[PDB]
Amino acid sequence: SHGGTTRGILQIRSDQQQSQHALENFKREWKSSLSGINGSWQIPVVMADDIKFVNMTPTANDMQFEKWLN
Amino acid sequence: KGKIIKGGKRFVQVVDKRVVASFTSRELAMGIRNPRTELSSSGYGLSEVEIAMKEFIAYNNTESFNDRFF
Amino acid sequence: SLYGQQQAYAEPFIEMMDTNPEFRDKRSYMKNEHNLHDVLKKFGNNPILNAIILTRSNQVAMYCQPARYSEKGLGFEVRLRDLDAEPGRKEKEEMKRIEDFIVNTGKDKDVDRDSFQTFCKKIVRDTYIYDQVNFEKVFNKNNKTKLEKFIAVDPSTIFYATDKKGKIIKGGKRFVQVVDKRVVASFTSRELAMGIRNPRTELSSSGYGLSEVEIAMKEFIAYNNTESFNDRFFSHGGTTRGILQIRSDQQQSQHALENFKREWKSSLSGINGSWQIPVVMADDIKFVNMTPTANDMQFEKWLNYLINIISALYGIDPAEIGFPNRGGATQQQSQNKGLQPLLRFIEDLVNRHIISEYGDKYTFQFVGGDTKSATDKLNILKLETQIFKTVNEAREEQGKKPIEGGDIILDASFLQGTAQLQQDKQYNDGKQKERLQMM
Numbered sequence: 001s002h003g004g005t006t007r008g009i010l011q012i013r014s015d016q017q018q019s020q021h022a023l024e025n026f027k028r029e030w031k032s033s034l035s036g037i038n039g040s041w042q043i044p045v046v047m048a049d050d051i052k053f054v055n056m057t058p059t060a061n062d063m064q065f066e067k068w069l070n
Numbered sequence: 071k072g073k074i075i076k077g078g079k080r081f082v083q084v085v086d087k088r089v090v091a092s093f094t095s096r097e098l099a100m101g102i103r104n105p106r107t108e109l110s111s112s113g114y115g116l117s118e119v120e121i122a123m124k125e126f127i128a129y130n131n132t133e134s135f136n137d138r139f140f
Numbered sequence: 141s142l143y144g145q146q147q148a149y150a151e152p153f154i155e156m157m158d159t160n161p162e163f164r165d166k167r168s169y170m171k172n173e174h175n176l177h178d179v180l181k182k183f184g185n186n187p188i189l190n191a192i193i194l195t196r197s198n199q200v201a202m203y204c205q206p207a208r209y210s211e212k213g214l215g216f217e218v219r220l221r222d223l224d225a226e227p228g229r230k231e232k233e234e235m236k237r238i239e240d241f242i243v244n245t246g247k248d249k250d251v252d253r254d255s256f257q258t259f260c261k262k263i264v265r266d267t268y269i270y271d272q273v274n275f276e277k278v279f280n281k282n283n284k285t286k287l288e289k290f291i292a293v294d295p296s297t298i299f300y301a302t303d304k305k306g307k308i309i310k311g312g313k314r315f316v317q318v319v320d321k322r323v324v325a326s327f328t329s330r331e332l333a334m335g336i337r338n339p340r341t342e343l344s345s346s347g348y349g350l351s352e353v354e355i356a357m358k359e360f361i362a363y364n365n366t367e368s369f370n371d372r373f374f375s376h377g378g379t380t381r382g383i384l385q386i387r388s389d390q391q392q393s394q395h396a397l398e399n400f401k402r403e404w405k406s407s408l409s410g411i412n413g414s415w416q417i418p419v420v421m422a423d424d425i426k427f428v429n430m431t432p433t434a435n436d437m438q439f440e441k442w443l444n445y446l447i448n449i450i451s452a453l454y455g456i457d458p459a460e461i462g463f464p465n466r467g468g469a470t471q472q473q474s475q476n477k478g479l480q481p482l483l484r485f486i487e488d489l490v491n492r493h494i495i496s497e498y499g500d501k502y503t504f505q506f507v508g509g510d511t512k513s514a515t516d517k518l519n520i521l522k523l524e525t526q527i528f529k530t531v532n533e534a535r536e537e538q539g540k541k542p543i544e545g546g547d548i549i550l551d552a553s554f555l556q557g558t559a560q561l562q563q564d565k566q567y568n569d570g571k572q573k574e575r576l577q578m579m
Contacts, residue, residue, distance in 0.1 A: 037134055040135055085149060093147065140369060
């Protein structure tokens with residue numbers, strides 16, 4: 001019912017922060033190629049200097065404080 | 071007046087949105103296994119497929135996701 | 141026309157334009173393809189499906205012998221319609237003749253013709269692949285009223301005939317055979333049967349049955365390409381273990397590499413020199429792995445799931461075809477749901493199509509292999525008789541005549557009560573002699 005459900009952040013290093021128009025076109029390409037069941041198994045390609053993915057939540061979530069409730 | 075009829079012909083057959091024939095109560099039976107009292111349904115039964123529609127599409131697209139690897 | 145004279149419509153009001161006027165085509169569920177049995181014939185060769193077919197055929201083949209010729213009760217039998225009705229020498233002979241006729245599939249023996257065992261083995265395949273079964277009858281030419289022979293015909297070539305208006309016909313010839321899209325012959329309803337195991341009411345199918353192969357088509361192709369994926373590791377490349385890199389300022393000439401290979405093969409190849417260790421004095425050496433330490437089959441649980449659902453569609457236990465049940469056990473109940481409905485379907489078809497030619501008073505049924513149910517029935521009777529039922533009432537109830545001895549209820553106590561009552565009754569009734577003596 002509230003936020004905090006993010007899996008992680010995809011960082012892309014660049015000398016300049018890309019203009020928002022470029023990021024919107026990036027999103028358009030990403031959605032057209034990968035979004036949904038359509039193109040689910042495909043792999044994108046990017047030629048940036050360095051890319052990282054930092055995890056904000058664990059691999060698999062589950063209920064917390066179960067024994068406390070019991 | 072739009073109200074459902076009791077006397078005489080009560081059930082009607084429709085094909086391609088055209089009325090073809092109609093039947094007396096004795097001439098045609100009507101069995102409802104999962105009845106409901108709310109006015110919205112007007113006596114028509116509730117099918118489990120409608121209840122499980124979301125689950126059915128989820129199963130279908132899960133199977134598609136598994137098969138799309140091959 | 142499809143079933144008879146009726147007020148409602150049970151056939152498509154508007155005909156399919158691309159179909160030939162002479163008959164109504166059989167089409168897929170979604171109308172995706174107007175030609176279905178052609179693609180089902182492709183899946184007819186699948187091993188899993190063929191394994192199920194062969195297992196069920198072997199199961200049925202045991203039952204396909206007459207009872208009275210078998211030392212044990214397993215087999216089939218013909219009897220009067222009423223179990224309580226008495227038999228007779230004439231009727232017994234007629235039933236024996238009919239049983240022999242069914243066994244030989246004709247009036248007289250002929251080695252060139254199918255025994256009923258092979259007929260059933262054909263029928264199960266046609267029932268489980270196409271969900272449609274047909275067999276031709278051969279009435280006597282000297283007398284149309286009576287029957288001589290009957291044999292099976294492939295269901296793929298048979299269609300429902302239609303009139304000039306395109307509606308399915310009832311009177312006269314109703315079924316038509318088509319080969320290479322050409323009409324060859326047509327048959328009267330009595331002359332050709334039509335068995336549908338999985339019927340449907342929607343106008344789109346127009347009475348044609350729904351085959352499980354069409355439902356499992358996606359699963360079947362998934363199984364096929366999964367097997368191909370597993371086999372392509374061997375039948376195609378990608379079996380390398382790794383690459384042995386040797387760093388050098390210059391790439392060695394191919395002659396040097398060939399001599400290197402010669403030395404390597406002479407020293408290490410084969411069992412000979414298997415345990416030896418070579419020595420190399422290069423700057424740096426690496427071995428990079430392209431495949432894991434040990435290989436094995438992939439997508440195993442996917443295959444188990446697919447075959448489990450395919451088996452569940454046909455009602456067969458996956459354990460019979462060498463797969464694990466994803467739930468339950470990981471046989472009587474599996475048999476009860478799997479085989480018995482098929483036997484009853486064949487029973488009803490054969491009865492209503494063959495025995496109709498001889499008379500209503502007879503019927504055809506299978507027997508045997510159901511001791512436990514009969515045991516429970518006898519146990520019901522054995523418990524009931526202790527308190528409730530007399531011996532003679534039960535004997536009458538099961539189409540038999542009473543035995544002299546009284547309609548006794550079997551309990552050692554109850555007999556003593558009747559005997560004691562009779563003994564004391566005779567004592568009391570004996571006092572009438574004294575009553576008359578005073579007269």
